Structures are given as structure tokens and as C-alpha cells.
Design a protein around this ligand. Structure first.
Ligand SMILES: O=C(O)/C=C/c1ccc(NC(=O)C2(NC(=O)c3ccc4c(C5CCCCC5)c5n(c4c3)CC(=O)Nc3ccccc3-5)CCCC2)cc1
Ligand SMILES: O=C(O)COc1ccccc1C(=O)Nc1c(OCc2ccc(Cl)cc2)cccc1C(=O)O
Length: 551
């Protein structure tokens, strides 16, 4: 069937930023017919996946538990209540939610309505490698449906992918654990070969059968009868497809592929990508495969069979994925160095700690992170990508010297160090105070993230070249600025001094000892690197469970 059909009604609105203008160009690419042919490898992998799902027991979340998971700036319902009413458990919100739930149990076939919208993302043009990227599309149900999805499937999408995929499930890893996983997998091979597989419009490649196969994996869970019916009903009425409405309420057409803004998007895409990839590994006869999957993002680390043989197996893997309705964007290329693999926009690099020991870390080209931070400094934004990049890329040269220095000077000038800000980690929203950054960093990357040096020449040059192309002052200027930022932070004591001492120890002439932060243990990060929730509409506020009086 067609991934999408359109009426003609426009997708209306609600260093460039992506707009609803370019939505017409995106529609053309994501609109096609799917031809999927399944085989014995696919059927075998599926049965193996279902046997592991059979060990999962999932709980039905209460209305209150589901309401607490709703982000405060989550789109309001078309039925007279918003995200604040949901979080406060107002009678109107709760009554509406309970009737939407009852309707999921009684109606098994009527397609649920969704809103289509062009996502606004900040990119960096540079007319040296083509032109501007068209806006991505976001398809999501009403607020009431979104709360019901959490009641029925929040525990499923948080527990099941790990039980099914094991160590291949990428969202269970902090950046430090992701690093450790890839390094260990690379070292486990006699002669390693690795590749990244990029699918062309993954959401659009997802067929109705893929969505039903995904439900067959969920149905293997021990579930409450009502959860079981809600999964069945949500699959038919929402997940498989349904009508699309623009921001103006006009009928835009119809979808028969994956919706980007449903709770099961990340889980479903990870399960589908893993299933198709593991099956294709068998068709291509790749030896001792190690996969790492985050939605549509796949990395394969395997045993090399020779330069000509690896190229042949990669074309075979591609032919199999294409048959499964997952053709590539860019053709995959075999890499024989771990650093040469770019997965989830990131690559492995090495540095040294204070005692000269090797430390592997994840980094990426810093153009987009810096362009986005520049946009966010210029105008007020709901999500601060700068904060997420400080969190995820804390050991990197660019995040330490530029992002930490720039944003801590602004927070110092605005006296906003204690003000909690929202950031997105694995598709989920987190309300974090900048003053908690040293404890967060120690927990995800280790105490060494504050003492890293001996960066590679390639990494230094990439960062340096990037600062030049963007008009950012050189690294020597940042060192000077960090010294004042650090001095002012130290003078304030408490968590602010810890920000000075730990985040800016790289800037001082004579470096400090740096002992573990005692209050880092009491930080509750149990909901952090568990699962992916892209378009899932998930919120968590950071908690410091059991505080000592002297901390
Ligand atoms: O010794 C030498 O040889 C050269 C010395 C030298 C060169 C330039 C400066 N610049 C400045 O002082 C000013 N800008 C900055 O001190 C500045 C700070 C952050 C900047 C950023 C980002 C960096 C990441 C966090 C968010 C801010 C960008 N740009 C920045 C400029 C340059 C800019 O204006 N815009 C962009 C656009 C895209 C990407 C980055 C930028 C402030 C007043 C005048 C301009 C200072 C010293
Ligand atoms: O790494 C990037 O360039 C963007 O990643 C981020 C940076 C800051 C804030 C959030 C993200 C993020 O959650 N990224 C994601 C991801 O990363 C997987 C990974 C893990 C650790 C590192 Cl160091 C790099 C990549 C896998 C799948 C989906 C997403 C998502 O966008 O929701």
C-alpha cells in the first residue's frame, strides 16, 4: 500500500530553521508504495524474539501515573483541556481520559485522528555540499489518546526491547556504556569490520504487517485483559494507519506507515530494524555479528572475510533489507577502524585522564550542536539542545571549552544557575538544573571527564576548522573566558563552586586534584538510560533522593 495519500490541503504552521514551506518536498520523498517479501531468516529471528518477549510481565499504569508522565508543554487536547490540567488531575482531563480509554476497549476498528505538522529543526546550510534540508513531518494523536497509550504501553516500551534484543538495544546505555559496548565488540573480533546502515525514510518503509508483527511481540507479555484490548485496538485504529489533519483542522490525507508521534515509535522502530537487520545478517552470511540498534539507527560489528568478500556481503545485506522494505539512503561501507564508523551522528575517539591512562569517548562534528546553541542564545526556545549536548558530550573538547564556557557565563550574568531547564535525552524530556551538571557528568562519563586531555590531532583540527567556518573565537579565547567564569563560580560556594572546580579544571595553569562528588550517589537516574521515547511525549523531573544536611 501507499505510505501516504494526500488531499492537497497544506501542512499548515502552528544557519537556517526548517519550516512548513519545505513540507511539500518532504511529502514527495516519504510517499511511495511498499513491496515487502519475507523469508525463513525473518520468520526464524521473529520466533527467537517472541521467545524472549514471553519472559516480560507488563503493568497497566493508572490514570495518575500516566498523567505524571505528560510533559508540561505537551500539545493541548482538542476537547477543552491541556497538559497542565492533565498533570493537576483536573476533573475534565481525567473524565475525558477515562472515556477515551473506555472507547479503546469498546471500539476495535474506527481509525483515530492524528495531526500532521512540519517539525522546526535548526541546521547549518553551507552552499558547498548542496542545499537546504526539507522539514521532517510529525504525526501525533490527541492528548487524551497519548495518556491512554502510556496506561497501556508505557511499561511495555520501557521493559520489552531490552528483554528481546539484550545488549543490542542501544537505549539502555549511557554515552560511557555505549562507548564500552562498541570498543568491547570491536576487540572481541580477530579481524573486525563494522558498518552503519541508513534506511531511506524508515517511518515510511514500515508496513501494516510490520506493525502487526510488532503487536505479536507485545502480545507475548503477561498483560492485564484491558491492556491486551487497548494494544489490539490501538494497533488497528492508530498504529497501522489512520487519517491526517493539519493545524487548521483540514483533512490532509491518510497514513499507512509508522507515525512519528506515538508512544510505540521508538520501541517499534528498534524491534523492526533489529528484526530485519538480524535476518539480513543471515542472508549475507556475516560472521559473528554484534548489532547496536536505536530506532532506525543500526551499527553492525562483525568478523571480516576479506576486502572483496566484505563488500560482497554488504551488497547481499542491502539486497535482503531492500526485500524486507528497508532500502538504504546511502549504501553501507565497510570500515576497519572503529573511529571511522559514524552511528547516531557520533564516532569513538580516545583521550587520556590525569594519570595518562587511555579513555574512549563519543564525539561528533560540532557544526550542528554549535549552530543550535547559537540559535538558542539568540531567542527563547522550549528545549535547550545545548544542555543535552553538555550532558551527552561532556568529555568532548568542544562541549567543555565552548558550550560550558558560553552558557555558564550567560547563567552567571542572568543569575539563572538554579533555574531548571528542559532538555531531550533519547526522545524523553528532562527538567534539569545547570548546578547539577557536575554530578550528572560524573555518573554518565566518570570522574575522568573533568581531567581528559591528549585529544587526537583529527579531533582538534575538526573542532578548530569548525570554529573558523562559524565565526566563533579560537580555543585560546575560550580558555581566557573560562578562567573568569570559574573564578566567579568558585566565589559563590556550594554547587556553583563545584561547577567552577569540576567543569573548568581544564582552563587553570595548575590543575586541581578532583575527588568524587559525594552528592552524585543520591541523584536518581533510574529513568535515564533505560529506553528511547522518540515522539512518545515523555517527561521526567530530576530528583536528588535522600539529601545529606552538609550537601
Ligand atoms: O585573537 C584572535 O585572533 C581573535 C579573537 C576574537 C575573535 C572573535 C571574538 N568575538 C567576540 O568577542 C564576539 N562574539 C563571541 O564572543 C562569540 C561567542 C559565541 C559564539 C557562537 C556560539 C558558540 C556556541 C555556543 C552558542 C554561541 C557563535 N559565534 C559566537 C561568537 C559567532 C556568531 O556570531 N554566530 C554563530 C553562528 C553559528 C555557530 C556559532 C556562532 C562578542 C563581541 C564581538 C563578537 C573575540 C575574540
Ligand atoms: O548524538 C547526537 O548527535 C544527538 O544525540 C543526543 C545529544 C544530546 C541530547 C540527546 C541526544 C539523543 O538522545 N540522541 C539520540 C540517540 O543518541 C544515541 C547516542 C548516545 C550517546 C551519545 Cl554521546 C551519542 C549518541 C539515539 C536515538 C535517538 C536519539 C534522539 O535524538 O532522541
Amino acid at each position: 500500500s501507499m505510505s501516504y495519500t494526500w488531499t492537497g490541503a497544506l501542512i499548515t504552521p502552528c544557519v537556517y530553521a526548517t519550516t512548513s514551506r519545505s513540507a511539500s518536498l518532504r511529502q514527495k520523498k516519504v510517499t511511495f508504495d511498499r513491496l515487502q517479501v519475507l523469508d525463513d531468516h525473518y520468520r526464524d529471528v521473529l520466533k527467537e524474539m517472541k521467545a524472549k518477549a514471553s519472559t516480560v510481565k507488563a503493568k497497566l499504569l493508572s490514570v495518575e501515573e500516566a498523567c505524571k508522565l505528560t510533559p508540561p508543554h505537551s500539545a493541548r487536547s482538542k476537547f477543552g483541556y491541556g497538559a497542565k490540567d492533565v498533570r493537576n488531575l483536573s476533573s475534565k482531563a481525567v473524565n475525558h481520559i477515562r472515556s477515551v480509554w473506555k472507547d479503546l476497549l469498546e471500539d476495535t476498528e474506527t481509525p483515530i485522528d492524528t495531526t500532521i505538522m512540519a517539525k522546526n529543526e535548526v541546521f547549518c546550510v553551507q552552499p558547498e555540499k548542496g542545499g537546504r534540508k526539507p522539514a521532517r513531518l510529525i504525526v501525533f494523536p490527541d492528548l487524551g489518546v497519548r495518556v491512554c497509550e502510556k496506561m497501556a504501553l508505557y511499561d511495555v516500551v520501557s521493559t520489552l526491547p531490552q528483554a528481546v534484543m539484550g545488549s543490542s538495544y542501544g537505549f539502555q546505555y549511557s554515552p560511557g556504556q555505549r562507548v564500552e559496548f562498541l570498543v568491547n565488540a570491536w576487540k572481541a573480533k580477530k579481524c573486525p569490520m563494522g558498518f552503519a546502515y541508513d534506511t531511506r525514510c524508515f517511518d515510511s518503509t514500515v508496513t501494516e504487517n510490520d506493525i502487526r508483527v510488532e503487536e505479536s511481540i507485545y502480545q507475548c507479555c503477561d498483560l492485564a485483559p484491558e491492556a491486551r484490548q487497548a494494544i489490539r485496538s490501538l494497533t488497528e485504529r492508530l498504529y497501522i494507519g489512520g487519517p491526517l489533519t493539519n493545524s487548521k483542522g483540514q483533512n490532509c490525507g491518510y497514513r499507512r506507515c509508522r507515525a512519528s508521534g506515538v508512544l510505540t515509535t521508538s520501541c517499534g522502530n528498534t524491534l523492526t530494524c533489529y528484526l530485519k537487520a538480524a535476518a539480513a545478517c543471515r542472508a549475507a552470511k556475516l560472521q559473528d555479528c554484534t548489532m547496536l540498534v536505536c530506532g532506525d539507527d543500526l551499527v553492525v560489528i562483525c568478523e571480516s572475510a576479506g576486502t572483496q568478500e566484505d563488500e560482497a556481503s554488504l551488497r547481499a545485506f542491502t539486497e535482503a533489507m531492500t526485500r524486507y522494505s528497508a532500502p538504504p539512503g546511502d549504501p553501507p561501507k565497510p570500515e576497519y577502524d572503529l573511529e571511522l564508523i559514524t552511528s547516531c551522528s557520533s564516532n569513538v575517539s580516545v583521550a587520556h585522564d590525569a594519570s595518562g591512562k587511555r579513555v574512549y569517548y563519543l564525539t561528533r562534528d560540532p557544526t550542528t550542536p554549535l549552530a543550535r546553541a547559537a540559535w538558542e542564545t539568540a531567542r527563547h526556545t522550549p528545549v535547550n539542545s545545548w544542555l543535552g549536548n553538555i550532558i551527552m558530550y561532556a568529555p568532548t573538547l568542544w562541549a567543555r571549552m565552548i558550550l560550558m564556557t558560553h552558557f555558564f557565563s550567560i547563567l552567571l550574568a542572568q543569575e539563572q544557575l538554579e533555574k531548571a531547564l528542559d532538555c531531550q535525552i533519547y526522545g524523553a524530556c528532562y527538567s534539569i538544573e545547570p548546578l547539577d551538571l557536575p554530578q550528572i557528568i560524573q555518573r554518565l562519563h566518570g570522574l575522568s571527564a573533568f581531567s581528559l586531555h591528549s585529544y587526537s590531532p583529527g579531533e582538534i583540527n575538526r573542532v578548530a576548522s569548525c570554529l573558523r567556518k562559524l565565526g566563533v573565537p579560537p580555543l585560546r579565547v575560550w580558555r581566557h573566558r573560562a578562567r573568569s567564569v570559574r573564578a566567579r563560580l568558585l566565589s559563590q560556594g556550594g554547587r556553583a563552586a563545584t561547577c567552577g572546580k569540576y567543569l573548568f579544571n581544564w582552563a587553570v595553569r595548575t590543575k586541581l586534584k578532583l575527588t568524587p562528588i559525594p552528592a552524585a550517589s543520591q541523584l536518581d537516574l533510574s529513568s535515564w538510560f533505560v529506553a528511547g521515547y522518540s515522539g512518545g511525549d515523555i517527561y521526567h523531573s530530576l530528583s536528588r533522593a535522600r539529601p545529606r544536611w552538609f550537601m
